[PDB]
Design an enzyme around this catalytic site. Structure first.
Site, mmCIF file in Angstrom:
data_model
loop_
_atom_site.group_PDB
_atom_site.id
_atom_site.type_symbol
_atom_site.label_atom_id
_atom_site.label_comp_id
_atom_site.label_asym_id
_atom_site.label_seq_id
_atom_site.Cartn_x
_atom_site.Cartn_y
_atom_site.Cartn_z
ATOM 1 N N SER A 107 83.334 20.399 -2.755
ATOM 2 C CA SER A 107 82.939 19.230 -3.356
ATOM 3 C C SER A 107 82.936 20.027 -5.240
ATOM 4 O O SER A 107 81.359 20.723 -5.005
ATOM 5 N N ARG A 108 84.294 19.491 -5.504
ATOM 6 C CA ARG A 108 83.634 20.040 -7.136
ATOM 7 C C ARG A 108 82.545 18.965 -7.052
ATOM 8 O O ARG A 108 81.434 19.220 -8.358
ATOM 9 N N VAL A 109 82.087 17.647 -7.381
ATOM 10 C CA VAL A 109 81.183 17.217 -7.458
ATOM 11 C C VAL A 109 81.154 16.136 -6.149
ATOM 12 O O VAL A 109 82.743 15.776 -5.158
#
Lengths: 157, 264, 131, 128, 47, 161
Positions: free
Chosen positions: D117-119
């Protein structure tokens, strides 16, 4: 590459020079495992030649096989007859190194012509283990095997 | 071969690599331990021999050698294998003792008979003095009585080095009972035997520990080597890879397009 | 003087340390070899080892066994199969052991077994020395 | 719509790989240059605008969202592949699923390490 | 002594019984540590 | 990624462009509007952009993925063009934060194909070198300022051969 790929058909003898052999500085710099002639055969060239060669071709070949392991993984996970062949192959290797008379400019060496017997015999002997206690550089840049012995002696100090 | 193959290799080769380190450090850790133990031991075995060779020891007118269980810890084992195989002719009851389960087919296969005992668990869980006594006790209580005797183990020299060492084993209590040895004695054939005994365990232990330690380091080394080896090798391959990889890619765009959307 | 080498396989306590004397319950006896002393081998009993360290200090030990090795020289080497400093030994047990021991001996039929007990008895006792 | 109506929407694009194929095919047939791996370039663009259309709206837009759950079916894990690389560069992570565990039983069977999850994380739960 | 020594019994055996009795001896965790020394596992190969 | 990337970057702006009286330009090529949005707030936050200054310290020029290629393709050049004013004219040591030449590169090539051009090897625009050449050569220190260029580099395939 298609071109060389084609070529073979039209050949009768291929000399494939090995970048590795060359890279070992060995001059002859050959890829002996594709410096060939279809006209290798006991039938033609007498079997002695042939066989010896096949023994060699083999010896290298087996040796070839090991290489991938040994490459990172050294020895002793190999038997010493394998070592023997390896070494022999190596002697042989050096023996193919046969100096260059012409290119003393490149070599400094004077190169050899090997009349055939010294060759056939030569290998038969190494194979015979007759050379298998000599320094390998003895074969390095020699033509006739005797000279390799001669060269051995001095290399043996 | 093709990137696949190459990777098959690569893949596995790391795996190996990783594994190779796994075996390595574990061993190195063992090594660390091995060092420690070597302290009281060092003394201890050294002591035995400094009685034996406070004076010196002799033969009348047996051998024992010891090593690991596994290989891939160098050819550490091969060395003892070698050096006991060399011996035997001269003897003077003959026995060999190979403790070792590497010395087991590098030596229990010749003297697989002329062996007196062999021990296993020769490493591969940490052996101790207890074991030395164990192996000692019954050994005595044997019917092959001791004629000659040397103890061959890998004497550690530093992790980097061991030299398969040899000692003389003159359990034969008429070595002790005799010579100047009896003149360095200055007290009877009990303690004679019961030191010959006792000291035998000490050395046994020691020698063993030196051996194993050597082994322990040798395995480390072997496992070491490899994981480095792998690394370089990867390095080459990974290129060979790429190269073919783009080579491909590009080349396909050719065949795809202009190569076969040349007009196609 | 004596270079006193005190070790068990497992622990080396003094190593050719300038100890004056050690009185050693060798199976041989309890003798207090001070300094050098002729070649002699004496096998260590279980007893307590009293290491008259050349300094009025004596370290205490129980020795179980091993051999002390009496060179000619100054260096004398107790290599006790087991040598422990008395510090870690246990009366509760010593007695306890002894009781048992004494219980066992009685059924420990045959000299060796009896012996094993007896050794043990002797042992517990020899702990009991110090305990 | 929902996104703009404060409503939080979820679109699961399941799966874009097949679409891309189709699209490529479409380009090519349109003659229209494709590109990489025989695929058109603005199949990226295509999705880029699409996926940009999946976003978290502010309050002016009711605070809504359109959450996009792309699916890419790894074809033998291949992602190196143009579009995945595209997509990879686009995403807000990728959630890598692994077989081995699945086979282990281990279901979920994910490779978390490979999951990303990059973000995501400004959007969790202290409890958790 | 000799009720063991002349029970024969390895001097090792003696010793080892002694020592073992020491192992038997010791307090608490000290006595735990006993087992260290009694690495004695050493598989009984025997030719 | 966002390892205080931006933060760092912001901090860098602080450290130089403040310290040394520098200038900055941020060219967001092919980024996520969202992340840029975020960035905005970060920029506000950082005070390298002040909402109080439309002349703060950083120009953000954005040509996010959602644009057609050309726009993304040009957005660096565009920015470059600003920065050149800023360089020469505004005499400045411009920091040109570039996000992200790779995506740019990628973008360029996209049209190369679609332009029916042959983008050279590996698919990539034949003019890759010249576009670069001119670009990289657009960047420099003159007799006036410097456009000191900070380029985000997405590394294709962690590979770069």
């Amino acid at each position: 590459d298609p071109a060389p790929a084609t070529t073979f058909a039209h050949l009768d003898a291929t000399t494939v020079l090995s970048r590795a052999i060359a890279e070992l500085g060995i001059y002859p710099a050959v890829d002996p495992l594709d410096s060939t002639s279809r006209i290798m055969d006991p039938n033609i060239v007498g079997s002695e030649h042939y066989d010896v060669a096949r023994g060699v071709q083999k010896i290298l070949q087996d040796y070839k096989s090991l290489q991938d392991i040994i490459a990172i993984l050294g020895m002793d996970e190999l038997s010493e007859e394998d070592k023997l062949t390896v070494s022999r192959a190596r002697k042989i290797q050096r023996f193919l190194s046969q100096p260059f008379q012409v290119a003393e400019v490149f070599t400094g060496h004077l190169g050899k012509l090997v009349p055939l017997k010294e060759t056939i015999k030569g290998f038969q002997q190494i194979l015979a283990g007759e050379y298998d206690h000599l320094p390998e550089q003895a074969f390095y840049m020699v033509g006739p095997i005797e000279e390799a012995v001669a060269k051995a002696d001095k290399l043996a100090e | 071969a093709t990137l696949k193959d190459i990777t098959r290799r690569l893949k596995s080769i790391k795996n190996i690599q990783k594994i190779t380190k796994s075996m390595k450090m574990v061993a190195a850790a063992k090594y660390a331990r091995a060092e420690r133990e070597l302290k009281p031991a060092r003394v201890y075995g050294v002591g035995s021999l400094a009685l034996y060779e406070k004076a010196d020891i002799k033969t009348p007118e047996l051998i024992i050698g010891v090593s690991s269980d596994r290989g891939l810890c160098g050819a550490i084992h091969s060395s003892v294998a070698k050096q006991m195989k060399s011996e035997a002719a001269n003897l003077k009851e003959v026995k060999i003792i190979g403790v070792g389960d590497k010395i087991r087919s590098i030596l229990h296969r010749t003297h697989s008979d002329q062996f007196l005992v062999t021990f296993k668990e020769v490493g591969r869980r940490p052996p101790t003095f207890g074991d030395a006594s164990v192996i000692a006790l019954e050994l005595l209580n044997s019917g092959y009585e001791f004629d000659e005797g040397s103890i061959i183990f890998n004497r550690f020299r530093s992790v980097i080095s061991y030299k398969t060492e040899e000692k003389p084993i003159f359990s034969l209590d008429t070595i002790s009972s005799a010579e100047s040895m009896s003149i360095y004695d200055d007290i009877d054939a009990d303690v004679l035997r019961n030191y010959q005994e006792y000291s035998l365990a000490n050395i046994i232990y020691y020698s063993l520990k030196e051996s194993t330690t050597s082994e322990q380091s040798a395995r480390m080394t072997a496992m070491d080597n490899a994981s480095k080896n792998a690394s370089e090798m990867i390095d080459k391959l990974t290129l060979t890879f790429n190269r073919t990889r783009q080579a491909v890619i590009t080349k396909e765009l050719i065949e795809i397009i202009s190569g076969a959307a040349a007009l196609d | 003087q004596m270079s006193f080498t005190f070790a068990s396989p497992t622990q080396v306590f003094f190593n050719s340390a300038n100890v004056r004397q050690v009185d050693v319950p060798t199976q041989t006896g309890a003798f207090g070899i001070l300094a050098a002393h002729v070649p002699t081998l004496q096998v260590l009993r279980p007893g307590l080892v009293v290491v008259h360290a050349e300094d009025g200090t004596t370290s205490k030990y129980f020795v179980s066994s091993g051999s002390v090795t009496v060179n000619a020289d100054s260096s004398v080497q107790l290599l006790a199969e087991e040598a422990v400093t008395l510090d870690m030994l246990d009366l509760g047990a010593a007695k306890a052991n002894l009781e048992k021991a004494q219980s066992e001996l009685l059924g420990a039929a045959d000299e060796a077994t009896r012996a094993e007990i007896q050794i043990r008895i002797e042992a517990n006792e020899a702990l009991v020395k110090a305990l | 719509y929902f996104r703009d109506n404060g409503k939080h929407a979820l679109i699961i694009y399941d799966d874009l790989s097949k679409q891309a194929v189709a699209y490529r095919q479409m380009s090519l047939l349109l003659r229209r240059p494709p590109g990489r791996e025989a695929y058109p370039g603005d199949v990226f663009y295509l999705h880029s605008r699409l996926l940009e259309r999946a976003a978290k709206m502010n309050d002016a837009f009711g605070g809504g969202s359109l959450t996009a759950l792309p699916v890419i079916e790894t074809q033998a894990g291949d992602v190196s592949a143009y579009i995945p690389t595209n997509v990879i560069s686009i995403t807000d992570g990728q959630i890598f699923l692994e077989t081995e565990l699945f086979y282990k039983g281990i279901r979920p069977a994910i490779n978390v390490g490979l999951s990303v999850s990059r973000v995501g994380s400004a959007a969790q739960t202290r409890a958790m | 002594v000799a009720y063991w020594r002349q029970a024969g019994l390895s001097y090792i055996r003696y010793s080892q019984i002694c020592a073992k009795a020491v192992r038997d001896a010791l307090k608490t965790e000290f006595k735990a540590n006993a087992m260290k020394t009694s690495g004695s596992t050493i598989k009984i190969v025997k030719v | 990624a966002g390892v205080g990337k931006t933060v760092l970057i912001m901090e860098l702006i602080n450290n130089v462009a403040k310290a040394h009286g520098g200038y900055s330009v941020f060219a967001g090529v092919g980024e996520r509007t969202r992340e840029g949005n975020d960035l905005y707030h970060e920029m506000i936050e950082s005070g390298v952009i002040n909402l109080k200054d439309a002349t703060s310290k950083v120009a953000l020029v954005y040509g996010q993925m959602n644009e057609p290629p050309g726009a993304r393709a040009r957005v660096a050049l565009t920015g470059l063009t600003v920065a050149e004013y800023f360089r020469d004219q505004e005499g400045q040591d411009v920091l040109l934060f570039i996000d992200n030449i790779f995506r740019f590169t990628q973008a360029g090539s996209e049209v190369s194909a679609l332009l029916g051009r042959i983008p050279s090897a590996v698919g990539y625009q034949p003019t890759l070198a010249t576009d670069m050449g001119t670009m990289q050569e657009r960047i420099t220190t003159t007799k006036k300022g410097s456009i000191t260029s900070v380029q985000a580099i997405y590394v294709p395939a962690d590979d770069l051969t």
